[PDB]
Amino acid sequence: MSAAITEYMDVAQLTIWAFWFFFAGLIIYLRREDKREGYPLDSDRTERSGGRVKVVGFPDLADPKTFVLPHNAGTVMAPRVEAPTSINATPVAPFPGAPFEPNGDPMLSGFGPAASPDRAKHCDLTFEGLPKIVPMRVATDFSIADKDPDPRGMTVVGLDGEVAGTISDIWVDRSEPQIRYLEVDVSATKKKVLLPIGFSRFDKKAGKVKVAAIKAAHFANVPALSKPDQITLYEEDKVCAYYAGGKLYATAERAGPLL
Amino acid sequence: PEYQNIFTAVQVRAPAYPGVPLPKGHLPRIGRPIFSYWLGKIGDAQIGPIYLGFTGTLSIIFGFIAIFIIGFNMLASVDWNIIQFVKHFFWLGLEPPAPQYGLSIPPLSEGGWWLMAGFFLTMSIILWWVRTYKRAEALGMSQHLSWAFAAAIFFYLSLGFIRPVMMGSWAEAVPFGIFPHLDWTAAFSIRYGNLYYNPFHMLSIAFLYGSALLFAMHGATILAVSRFGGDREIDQITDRGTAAERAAIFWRWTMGFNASMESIHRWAWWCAVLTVITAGIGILLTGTVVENWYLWAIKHGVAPAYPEVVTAVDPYAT
Amino acid sequence: AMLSFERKYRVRGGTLIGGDLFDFWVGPFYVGFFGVTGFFFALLGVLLIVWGATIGPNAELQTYNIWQISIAPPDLSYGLGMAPLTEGGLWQIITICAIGAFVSWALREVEICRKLGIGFHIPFAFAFAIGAYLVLVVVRPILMGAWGHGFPYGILSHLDWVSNVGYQFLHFHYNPAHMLAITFFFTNCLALSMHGSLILSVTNPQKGEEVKTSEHENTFFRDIVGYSIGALAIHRLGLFLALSAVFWSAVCIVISGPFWTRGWPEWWNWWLELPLW
Amino acid sequence: MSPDLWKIWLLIDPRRVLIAVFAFLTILGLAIHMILLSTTEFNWLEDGIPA
Amino acid sequence: MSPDLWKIWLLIDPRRVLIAVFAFLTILGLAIHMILLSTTEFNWLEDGIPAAKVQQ
Amino acid sequence: MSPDLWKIWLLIDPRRVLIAVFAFLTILGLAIHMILLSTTEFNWLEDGIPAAKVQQTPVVPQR
Amino acid sequence: CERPPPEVVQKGYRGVAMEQNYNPRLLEASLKQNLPVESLPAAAPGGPKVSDVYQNVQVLKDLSVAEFTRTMVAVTTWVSPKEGCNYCHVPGNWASDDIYTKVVSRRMFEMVRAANSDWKQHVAVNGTGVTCYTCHRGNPVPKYVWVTDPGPNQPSGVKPTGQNYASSTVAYAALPFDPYTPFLDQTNEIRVIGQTALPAGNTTSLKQAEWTYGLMMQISDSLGVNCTFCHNSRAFYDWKQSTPQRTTAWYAIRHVRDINQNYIWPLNDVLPASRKGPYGDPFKVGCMTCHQGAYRPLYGAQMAKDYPALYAS
Amino acid sequence: PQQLYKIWLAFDPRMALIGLGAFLFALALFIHYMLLSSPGFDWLLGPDHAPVALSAGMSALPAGR
Ligand code: BCL
Ligand code: BCL
Ligand SMILES: CC[C@H]1c2cc3[nH]c4c(c3C)C(=O)[C@H](C(=O)OC)c4c3nc(cc4[nH]c(cc(n2)[C@@H]1C)c(C(C)=O)c4C)[C@@H](C)[C@@H]3CCC(=O)OC/C=C(\C)CCC[C@H](C)CCC[C@H](C)CCCC(C)C
Ligand SMILES: CC[C@H]1c2cc3[nH]c4c(c3C)C(=O)[C@H](C(=O)OC)c4c3nc(cc4[nH]c(cc(n2)[C@@H]1C)c(C(C)=O)c4C)[C@@H](C)[C@@H]3CCC(=O)OC/C=C(\C)CCC[C@H](C)CCC[C@H](C)CCCC(C)C
Ligand SMILES: COC(C)(C)C/C=C/C(C)=C/C=C/C(C)=C/C=C/C(C)=C/C=C\C=C(C)\C=C\C=C(C)\C=C\C=C(C)\C=C\CC(C)(C)OC
Ligand code: HEC
Ligand SMILES: [Ca+2]
Ligand SMILES: [Ca+2]
Ligand SMILES: [Ca+2]
Ligand SMILES: [Fe+3]
Ligand SMILES: [Mg+2]
Secondary structure, eight states: OOSBSSSSOBHHHHHHHHHHHHHHHHHHHHHHHHTTSSOSBBOHHHHHTTSOSOBOOSSOOOOOOEEEEGGGTEEEESSOOOOOOOOSOEESSSSTTOOEEOOSOSGGGOOGGGOOOOOOSSOOBOSSSOBSEEETTTOTTOEEOTTSOOOSSOEEEOTTSOEEEEEEEEEEESSSOSEEEEEEEETTTTEEEEEEGGGOEEETTTTEEEOOSSOGGGGGSOOOOSBTTBOOHHHHHHHHHHHHHHHHHSSTTTTOOOO | OOOOSSSOSSOEEOOOOOOSOOOTTOOOOBSOOBOOTGGGGTSOOOBOOBOOOHHHHHHHHHHHHHHHHHHHHHHHTTTTOHHHHHHTTTTOEEOOOOGGGTTSOOOGGGTHHHHHHHHHHHHHHHHHHHHHHHHHHHTTOOOHHHHHHHHHHHHHHIIIIIHHHHHTOGGGSOOEEHHHHHHHHHHHHHHTTOGGGOHHHHHHHHHHHHHHHHHHHHHHHHHHTGGGTTTOHHHHHHSOOHHHHHHHHHHHHHHSOOOOTTTHHHHHHHHHHHHHHHHHHHHHSBTTTBSOHHHHHHHTTOSOOOOOOOOOOOTTOO | OBOTTOGGGOBSOOOSSOTTSSOOEETTEEOHHHHHHHHHHHHHHHHHHHHHHHHOSSSSSOOOOTTTOEEOOOOGGGTTSOOOGGGTHHHHHHHHHHHHHHHHHHHHHHHHHHHHTOOSHHHHHHHHHHHHHHIIIIIHHHHHTOGGGSOOEETTHHHHHHHHHHHTTSOGGGOHHHHHHHHHHHHHHHHHHHHHHHHHHHHSOSTTOOOOOHHHHHHHHHHHTSBOOOHHHHHHHHHHHHHHHHHHHHHHHHSTTTSOOSOTGGGGHHHHTOTTO | OOGGGGGGGGTSOHHHHHHHHHHHHHHHHHHHHHHHHTSSSSOTTTSOOOO | OOTTGGGGGGTSOHHHHHHHHHHHHHHHHHHHHHHHHTSSSSOSSSSOOSOOOSOO | OOGGGGGGGGTSOHHHHHHHHHHHHHHHHHHHHHHHHHSSSSOSSSSOTTOOOSOOOOOOTTO | OOOSOOEEEEOSSTTSOOEEEEOHHHHHHHHHTOOOOOOOOOOOOOSSBGGGTOSSOOSSTTSBHHHHHHHHHHHHHHTOTTTTTTTTSOTTOSSOOOSHHHHHHHHHHHHHHHHHHHOHHHHOSSSOOOOTHHHHTTOSSOSSOBOOOOOSOOOTTOOOOSOSSOBGGGTSBSSOSOOIIIIIISOOOOOOOOSSSSOOSOOOOHHHHHHHHHHHHHHHHHHTOOGGGTOBTTBSSOSTTSOHHHHHHHHHHHHHHHHIIIIIGGGGGTSOGGGBOTTSOBOBOOSTTTSTTSSSGGGGOOOSTTOGGGSOO | OOOGGGGGGTSOHHHHHHHHHHHHHHHHHHHHHHHHHSSSSOGGGOTTOOOOOOOSSOOSSOOOO
């Protein structure tokens, strides 16, 4: 029982080698956990082989893991199969790794920055089973903090500083009190559209809302809700993606380059 | 320019939330919650309530006794002069017994108070660990947090208790002070030959830098996709939306591989824990199986060599 | 190659420089113009590091051991001028190549996030680490007066540089900005451990139980410490701590030598010489 | 001093004033006793009197 | 100096100024006493006057 | 200065300038008094004037 | 706070970062405090001898009268210029020894002549030399002496630790603040680091490394340098990687121990009580007594070579 | 240049004045600091700057390789 195993080896060397073995095992485990979403990959190697060679890399995938959702919403497998889709674009060039062109009208195309998957068509729920994101017209116990603007009646201006409507209601979150959406009453179609907070800037001096994503004339194509009191995971994603597409498709100068 | 979601522009007030009901046989939560406006610009503007059981009361008592002993000895070291106590506060400390006692109990002024303070502080830390385990299990959750706290406690006990017992003396332990314990940290490296050459020290530093890198990347990633609802990570884990897809695709295009919304939080968990695990080993090997880390590195061909441009004559080798 | 849900996002445009000239993907990577520039800067830097290892400090101390390979900066007698290739100019060329590669990487990230339609938090955060490196090898050598104040490029030799620079001030723990940076680093590690633990605990409950909701996350930390910060605020705080650590470390290293040339404990004398005591 | 000083108590909360003055007086007494203990002339325990 | 200075209480809240004055005066008294005790000339306890019954 | 200077208060309110000035002059006076106390030429307490009448034992000449 | 740039002296291999940094303004101010004194003109060589005109000459027995009086005139300037010659000599004559100052100075002469002949591996590398002015600088009592420090007052039943207290003797660190007694007066081991990769019977505690650290802080404060002036910090124990000044420091420690044990302590009987510490020991010599913040006394000004009465032969 | 007034048709003057003032102030600070560092143009040393002369074989800085 000493510190020298041989003429060259000692304890502090064996300990570091044992750590390296454990670290290799841990890295394999973490990389296997990383591969529960989006694998097996979609490449030319699979389709040339007639759907025979599946590209997963190393290490391969794990056995499916089960999540059970509350209030009897169902069960979801962490590694699952999903239906291959047909995109709304067309390749710019036939060589591999080439970009695609957003066929049609880019805002109303569902491709690029204006793209989204199809989530479940049910509202997110609280711990008691109520809808989670609701307007303040039904969450009456809520209130605006003191010494704060209360953005009701504020005019919303578009990308070019042209007014596109006014705020009508505020959609809040019952579980965590914060604002998730603004409701804009568009004065071009007599309709009401939702606007995420992440795409709006509060000019509290002059009482304005700035939307730098889309222009004033684009507020007429925002996807609408099914019922005026609640929203689903599908519609929220669609609404956010429509505004996100304007970060590239709004004007002719936003595609680049600088030089 | 564009809203970066760093501060909350407009706040909304709802009534206080007592919390998820606890099962039978639990005490009620104490305190009435209140709201802070300035605290609500960066996070949640609600403070309280708190749960205090029996383990939580015992932890408080033990810890306050330990801290009172430490403070009383710091005050006694300046002969009861409170002004001089304020002047020298960062330099004062309570320090371990002398090396001529081994693992015995010295008088109070010569290291008994240090032993009592260490025992009581260790008891409070253990009781707080039990409290965290019990609160995790009361709500039906798992026990990851208690495992991470157990790793931290393992490093703490290696630093203060296990290594001195292995070396056979209490003088190897760290003092209770601000500048005193930094002095201990410097002297430990000097005595055992340049701790930079300890390979577990190298691994621990790598994991600390990695924790900082991982938290910066994850925070920036979640803040960048929060316009799509990305901050609600549980929903994205159980139902993948555009936030998770864009976050994965960004990193896949940047560095060739990516993680998942669920999987990244594992990379976060293991990176931090391995910071302290490799730390606790690194000092248990020091002084027990390795005497000089620089000479150990030279023996294993790790230390670099430089041209001889300055040198000294050895007066012990004449 | 492509994830099973990635083909919807490979759109044309959003480039900063180049347009359609370099707008393509190479395997999983997106390259662009800055991809080309950064890749070839990195390639030349690697090849020059390998050649510097091949030459070695001498013909006798040259070795291919990875722990012992070191490329060193010039002497302090050259000032801010350009040194001969064998006497420290290779270090300067490699430093230029490294700076070019880092800036190219950041600009490629900017292009990628313009393409995906997301915010610019990630390149902004990377710029802090780039700035810390630039303070290490550019700002401090110019303020001091010579390129020889930079650190050598080697796995074990730059540790020797850190140790000797630290002992030039006799006790580096008493540097105040150093204390602030260390506090931020430790706090960041603690916060990361807690965030990971809570998310995993909620997502992986006890056996025969359903996935926990958002209320449980807040209740847990209100019952442990009496306060909960929220889902978005924990990421805010993590980014803030991780960037503050680096900012204060850069401050701590740029004041050692240029703005203070004595021992670091002595700096505290202003507190000990107050007339109150 | 004018007799109408009793109007102070409708300007500041009596409970907070009571607790603040109690805490301040206790802290002041402790501080003065310790400062006296730190000296050589006024340390009644180590003065050696009576021997 | 001015027969109209009593308007000052129409601007600054008296309840705040009372607290900000009492606290400031207490802190100032403590600081001045500490400054005096930090000198060898005005330290009334360790000056050796009158006499010294204890040995040091 | 100009007779029409009194218009300055149409831009700055009395409360936020009165508080600032009153919280500023006190700090300036404290800082100046401390600076003078720090020097050996303008320290009125330890200047030795007038006389000492305080006796000032072996000493430690390292400090 | 200071403003750049500093003056830098490189000591090691490039990239190893063994350098000295000086603030030019601080350097000029420090230089203003260490100027030398212009020497007296040389004496006429020849004439009457010392051993034939003086009675109680014991140390300077082998000089000439002109050189003897020149040496007396110079040491009047070096030590006691204000009081003159009555400081050492009783008024009325010169052969009497009824005053302690003359005896102390007679011992000091032997100390200086021993320093200039027996310790040339310390004080004669560049021929700087040691004179009475090196320590006194015109003052009867040197400005940088030390005694055994008792530390801050403690309660009657509390055992002192000797540390955890801000002190300028260790450059304002929380290290043991009295490194003089165990090292510069007594003879304790300074080495704490082992010289094998694996344990073999080296039971030095961790608390002794702090005492060594305190002594090194005092040494570097006395010389106005940093650690890398003598060391390479990756191996403090390694003499092969150190600088030539480390050997000089090694000899200087022994020189100071010799001075304290053999020249200062035996004088403790005849010195007045105003020259002693609270423990009853006299004022003693350290690294600060001669260097006074410079890497050489007076930055290496050479004034000892002009006076041949300060050499043993 | 003849028709330079068209340069204000592309750049907003309100931002241009802010940028110009900030840049000019930064340039002035940098140049003053550079002069303060230089050993020839340092007016803080005083008009009567007389560095200490070395009477004997003394050197302010230690020798280095
Ligand atoms: C005796 C020595 C002194 C000491 C002397 C010094 C000196 C000297 C320095 C520090 C610095 C640090 N010290 Mg210290 N320090 C000491 C003791 C400590 C202790 C301790 C427990 O005692 C701790 C925790 C620390 C901690 C710290 C940190 C605050 C800081 C290092 C982090 C940093 O700068 O990030 C900065 C991060 C970077 C620079 C990363 C840059 C990476 C970029 C992005 C480039 C890309 C990398 C790569 C090329 C990518 C490709 C790689 C692969 C191919 C994929 N020190 C002792 C007392 N310390 C350093 C500092 O503050 O620097 C600013 C510093 O210079
Ligand atoms: C040279 C050093 C001298 C010395 C010279 C002086 C001089 C000169 C002065 C003091 C003053 C004070 N000294 Mg002294 N002082 C010495 C030694 C001491 C010792 C001691 C342990 O030996 C103590 C405990 C004190 C304590 C005190 C306080 C009583 C007082 C400062 C009070 C304060 O902080 O107001 C801050 C708090 C407030 C102002 C709150 C406001 C009070 C209210 C609103 C107004 C008064 C109402 C009152 C509370 C109740 C009714 C009182 C009526 C007016 C009768 N001195 C030594 C001997 N001392 C000052 C004094 O006399 O104050 C009265 C003063 O001018
Ligand atoms: C993964 C490794 C990292 C880590 C992890 C970690 N730390 C943890 C945990 C985990 C997983 C916990 O679960 C636990 C916790 O509770 O977190 C919220 C904790 C914790 N880490 C802590 C500290 C901590 N962690 C550190 C580091 C790290 N922790 C690592 C970097 C450090 C450093 C770097 O030094 C510190 C200081 C605690 C805040 C907490 C555990 C607290 C605990 O156990 O306390 C027990 C004792 C008491 C409560 C005594 C109290 C007695 C009286 C109340 C005193 C009265 C006087 C009072 C102090 C006066 C002042 C006024 C007061 C009102 C403040
Ligand atoms: C500022 C907060 C923290 C942070 C953040 C951060 N780092 C980042 C990012 C962010 C946000 C990225 O987006 C970016 C990334 O892509 O991450 C995956 C990155 C990154 N941070 C990295 C590393 C890294 N970060 C570190 C630190 C930190 N990064 C901070 C703690 C460290 C430390 C502490 O040492 C390292 C090593 C990379 C993995 C990656 C950037 C990759 C990159 O720039 O690639 C381009 C360059 C090359 C591929 C080759 C360069 C060619 C050179 C010739 C190499 C040698 C240069 C060197 C000067 C010589 C050798 C040095 C010796 C010491 C060996
Ligand atoms: C108003 O406030 C009052 C006056 C009441 C109290 C104030 C107190 C103050 C101001 C306290 C300040 C405290 C400070 C600054 C503390 C600093 C502490 C630090 C930095 C500590 C850092 C490290 C210390 C460590 C790691 C010590 C670890 C020791 C351990 C683990 C020892 C365990 C020992 C055991 C279990 C011994 C058992 C032996 C037996 C049981 C026999 O002992 C009795
Ligand atoms: C050059 C040859 C001389 C002469 C003529 C003297 N000294 Fe020194 N000296 C030194 C120390 C530490 C002391 C003790 C402190 C003290 O007593 O003041 C002395 C003391 C003296 C005295 C006695 C003065 C007195 O207090 O009455 C005298 C007369 C005296 N010295 C003369 C230190 C040193 C040195 C440092 C190593 C050197 C060199 C000298 N002295 C040289 C001389
Ligand atoms: Ca008594
Ligand atoms: Ca008195
Ligand atoms: Ca006076
Ligand atoms: Fe997260
Ligand atoms: Mg200590």
